[PDB]
Design a protein around this ligand. Structure first.
Ligand SMILES: O=C(CCCN1CCC(O)(Cc2ccc(F)cc2)CC1)c1ccc(F)cc1
Ligand SMILES: O=C(CCCN1CCC(O)(Cc2ccc(F)cc2)CC1)c1ccc(F)cc1
Ligand SMILES: O=C(CCCN1CCC(O)(Cc2ccc(F)cc2)CC1)c1ccc(F)cc1
Ligand SMILES: O=C(CCCN1CCC(O)(Cc2ccc(F)cc2)CC1)c1ccc(F)cc1
Ligand SMILES: [Cl-]
Ligand SMILES: [Cl-]
Ligand SMILES: [Cl-]
Ligand SMILES: [Cl-]
Lengths: 391, 391, 391, 391
């Protein structure tokens, strides 16, 4: 058992481990495309010789509150062979990548979790919430107040790549959780848009000047349309796209994986028709550099200037001053007023979780209820946090 | 078709309509107990002579943000005979009760909705959110940070009525959505605690000095425990009760109908184990007197003093000034800065829905994005809004 | 093994065999009430001493085409002990009862079959068709042409016995398949109308001057109302009762066991909403006396006078002359033009099955296609055949 | 929004709308084959430029009672874009095609309905009934009377095209509902006979001189054989094919979409084994020219000569004289004795629905019960109405 950066000769062994580890493995051709987002020294492997462990990160750009874009290490392709469980391989690989990520100057790392119980101990907190809405469209009537009572076109996704790219680029820059989508991921997305023999049905697009929806009929439930992606830059675009989706008269149900503040239910005369059928953690964040991350994002202007001392468990103690929507975060040995593990700060960082809620679980410790209210207000995001694409 | 306050002789006919209308009808004996909460002139019936329509309200006490308790008209027992649909009987009965409620001096009316599409047009907005969590307790491990790593007793509910009453009374006064639970509803609750032949299994209680949980094994799924009610006045009590529930080793799953900010998931090493299995509107509010309701509740201290002009569609136009956690709301003919239907104000009132989200659906109209942020912040509740008991 | 008429002392042993044989056994008290319809010498038992076989008939009145009422032997309570299978006990009991029924002067015997494969060989043919319609009432809109766009009352069944009795008596006299419902069966029907602990929910009635519907919410599916019985003497009553049933706004679905010519689907803008969810043989007929049965019923006036020779396999050969809606059926040794087993004549007798369809299965043999068309037309019923009550 | 006959350049846009509208879309290659049945000016499109609406008709030959073959406009490929709902596009397209169909000299139009609630208002009535029978073949025993107690061969469909074509041509000419099946539809049918990767299993044929059955094992239920098509010209062929299907010893169940008068159940000792698992409207008819359609079909010889006056709502009033199996239908201003909407006449026309049943729903209005009986008898079909192939 040695831990190394993989050579070109290691990648066939990594693809075997991937195929055996991930039921959703994209195959070697697609994986080779995703590889283009992994920097030199972005990957580690454990050899016994065959590959028994692997982990890597990709260079991402993540939007945080205040429309600030952070360089982000996106952890992915993490696997330990079923032959090598309970040997500390995950711990060793995560320790090495975190060392490389921190030394490289990334203020944050991010991942999507295979299970909810693994990444908390490595300092990752769930930072976005996936919210599945299922609409019984047979009953759906738009409210008198709903915009645009057409601006929308039914199109083939592959024929309107430029328009989707431009709309997505506008969306990702204005929404916390937004990720830059590089050209290789557009190539991959539009390749998946076509039907597969015994696989997915053909994808269609609804295109508005200021939004698009990509959807396909479910493989097995032929009365369910699944929206894979809806990106709307305006309220008018969001409503117009939903009027078109409710117009899919051959379907009983439209489902979408969205965010908790999706205004869809409020567009209907019966809010209950937009049923929450599933909820899960989306993007997870590890704050690598506490002061750099905390100084980088914008804060709520509504809360008056306040100062506190924040201790992150084995992450430093800082004088934190928040006023006029900006934070200053400097080293101190002054007594801590707030204490939390690193994972908890990740959960607060995009505004998806309230300091008050985490305090009620004793994940966040303070003796000052006023300070808790100020933190809740300051860390809150004006623009609701969304999830961009899984990686 | 005439609309009257019912005489004693009308109640057998009302109980027949109830039995035929409500699959969960509590029967004449329990209904006669609930009747004690209906004031003189609190009920209307339509006769054709037999009862073809009915509606009533009960005298309730509702806690709103700032621990303020409002007299509240709780609409209930609303039915139109299947023989008399589409004759405007619901509209006529709701118009008459609203007249009586407004003239009686109630600032707010409330109900639980049989369907989501009916009460919006009568000025009711959904004001609390029911959130069902299902825990696979076989996997549940408490976080190192979780309080109290016993203070809890397994007891017969009927033997500890005084302790439940006292804990509930503390809870309902400190939580927005809290309702006073009169003696007749305690009588009814503890009568339901015993097992029924071919019906519900026996209810048990977990009792802490500062909280209780009432639960029973599901009728048909013998590996599911359903928590009917958990009232905790402290974080220590909430965690202690959940440690005890996760200790129900004969169960696979524990389910509870709770609120979106329940800290349960954060008590576990795997937040994903507390799965959201169901979400629905809970309590609905109709603001009867806009200035009385808006002046009565407390507002967030974090937001700086601001002034605006609010128009409620056919509900008046008001100069609204919010500062130091209090509102002043006076008549004006000045140009409106914010417009919304009455139902929308109900949805904002307990802090369950953000002004920003309702604005994105065009249910709330303003040209000022700064004003929207200030409203979001001001109307937000420090203590998360919960649902008390169904009526 | 001896075959006897039971003594009073035999009935406890018959009730044990019944409980072990019939999952729907009505119990000794209800069975003692049904006993009042069994004539002296109407029952046989086989003893080994304990009861190992039983069979009986009740005195019924069956309506046949032309509003003619026939005395009918209703076979029921037929059981062989699981200890005594394949010993010819059913054959022996059926042979003896048929001897008694024939000698008593009954022209027809009838039964409801536990299985479809048993009674054909004893000369019983399925004579009515049960047709279950399930309406998704959330979508149901009445056609512009539908009558009565209220005459209907929601009532407690036990309070309107006289009105149900009178409506049913009018119905049973005008519909082929109609049975006289004696007072003991009204006593039993209204006793079942009340709810049972862990059993059926409360029954309700919709009452029109010229029709009624008895319905209850399903035990387990709380969004399904099951109509146990709808008797309408006019088209106006039938439509009015269905308008009321579609008005059960708490239900998703209304189901009824009806007949294939129920006009319900044609009352709706979408005929497809009245879905056929189940179909089965209803009443079975054994023609005991061929000439008496054939001379007794009315025939279609549309078909011109014709003569043929009918042979029933081991049931006689007859010169059959049909004209002006009446048949003459006299002994002959002339060559047969039509041959069929006795069971086939039972299937033709109420007009539920076409001679042409049975001929296509070679259950009915003729070389004359014109004769087949004349038989189809003559045996057809003006009033569609319905099923009264199970016995 | 303009309505035009499509140019060659419009068909890619029509195929996109088809793919997005029809989950069973046959793809561009098969659709191009079906196109060969669409006459010049047989198609309309709405452009906004992209295709947002389309509809066409094909030249068909439909068999009606009396073995009469009518030129028939088969409406198909009808779609409105989900972006253009509730804009009257369907009404506009149907009005234009009906104008073209009427002017072209078609006496009838026909379609298969995506939903049951749409085509009634455009004058289409459901005219055939689809009846799914599922046989539990493990229990199925043929009756002593059943023919042919082998004449049948198990063959590859593609190797016996000539024999299937010849049998089908005999069938379609003798059965009301029969359609001529052109060479392009035989090409398409035999292409679907082969297995597809992750798709349908291989089709097999059972071939008799006077009948064939095409069947395949269900994709997912490997104990279910689905008969896609059984065409039998004789009772012997029908029974022989069913003996062979019941001989599929690896199956639990055989299912077929047949007609209500299928004699299959009567071939078995247990009629109940042939269970009706599904029922739906099949072919829909719009009578374009009332007198031409009514004079064209044969009527029952059994009913004596009679005269009446029929009014079709906005379809004319006619003196209708029916005798010796023929109708004369001439213009009159004499008082109407029968009134009905055009859709109702379509439902009566192939004998699938009784005038009496439609009268009970008030879809057919007369004050003369004798006239109703005569219409029932006259419009009845000697040969039961069947459904040919979906289009
Ligand atoms: O496999 C990946 C990324 C995972 C993509 N993933 C995302 C969503 C999904 O497509 C549904 C499922 C799969 C990868 C491979 C090699 C490499 F170098 C870097 C990354
Ligand atoms: O029936 C009621 C109140 C409804 C209780 N409801 C609440 C929750 C539930 O118990 C589960 C279901 C039933 C009533 C009857 C008469 C009257 F005067 C006033 C009110
Ligand atoms: O048990 C019966 C008749 C059967 C009733 N049956 C009908 C429908 C049903 O109620 C649902 C099920 C039961 C009987 C008992 C004794 C006797 F002498 C004569 C008859
Ligand atoms: O798509 C069609 C006809 C529909 C066929 N349809 C029938 C049955 C089915 O195969 C199972 C499902 C599909 C068409 C296309 C172009 C054109 F010009 C004319 C017609
Ligand atoms: Cl999202
Ligand atoms: Cl709650
Ligand atoms: Cl019936
Ligand atoms: Cl058919």
């Amino acid at each position: 058992v040695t831990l190394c950066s993989p050579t070109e000769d290691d990648w066939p062994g990594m693809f075997l481990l991937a195929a055996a580890s991930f039921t959703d493995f994209i195959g070697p051709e697609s994986a080779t495309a995703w590889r283009t987002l992994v920097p030199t020294d972005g990957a580690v492997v454990v050899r016994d010789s065959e590959v028994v462990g692997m982990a890597l990160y990709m260079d991402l750009r993540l939007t945080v509150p205040g429309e600030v874009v952070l360089p982000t290490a996106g952890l992915s392709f993490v696997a330990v062979a079923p032959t090598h469980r309970r040997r500390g391989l995950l711990r060793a690989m995560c320790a090495e990548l975190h060392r490389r990520i921190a030394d490289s100057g990334y203020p944050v790392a991010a991942l999507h979790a295979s299970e909810g119980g693994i990444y908390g101990r490595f300092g990752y907190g769930p930072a976005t919430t996936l919210h599945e809405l299922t609409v019984d469209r047979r009953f759906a009537r738009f409210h008198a107040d709903a915009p645009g009572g057409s601006s929308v076109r039914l199109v083939r996704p592959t024929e309107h790549r430029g328009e989707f790219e431009a709309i997505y680029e506008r969306w990702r820059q204005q929404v916390p959780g937004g990720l830059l989508r590089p050209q290789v991921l557009w190539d991959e997305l539009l390749a998946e848009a076509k039907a597969a023999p015994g696989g997915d049905r053909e994808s269609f697009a609804l295109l508005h000047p200021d939004g698009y929806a990509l959807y396909r009929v479910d493989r097995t439930d032929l009365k369910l349309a699944r929206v894979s992606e809806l990106r709307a830059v305006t309220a008018d675009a969001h409503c117009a796209l939903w009027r078109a989706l409710i117009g899919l008269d051959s379907m009983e149900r439209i489902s979408i994986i969205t965010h908790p503040q999706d205004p869809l239910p409020h567009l209907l005369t019966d809010t209950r028709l937009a049923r929450t059928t599933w909820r899960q953690d989306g993007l997870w964040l590890r704050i690598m550099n506490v002061p750099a991350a905390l100084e980088a994002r914008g804060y709520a202007h509504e809360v008056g200037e306040f100062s506190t001392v924040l201790e992150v468990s084995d992450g430093g103690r800082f004088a934190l001053k928040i006023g006029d929507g900006r934070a200053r975060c400097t080293p101190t040995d002054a007594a801590a007023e707030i204490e939390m593990d690193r994972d908890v700060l990740g959960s607060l960082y995009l505004g998806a979780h309230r300091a008050s809620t985490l305090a009620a679980a004793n994940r966040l410790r303070t003796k000052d209820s006023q300070l808790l209210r100020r933190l809740d207000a300051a860390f809150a995001s004006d623009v609701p946090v969304q999830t961009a694409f899984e990686f």
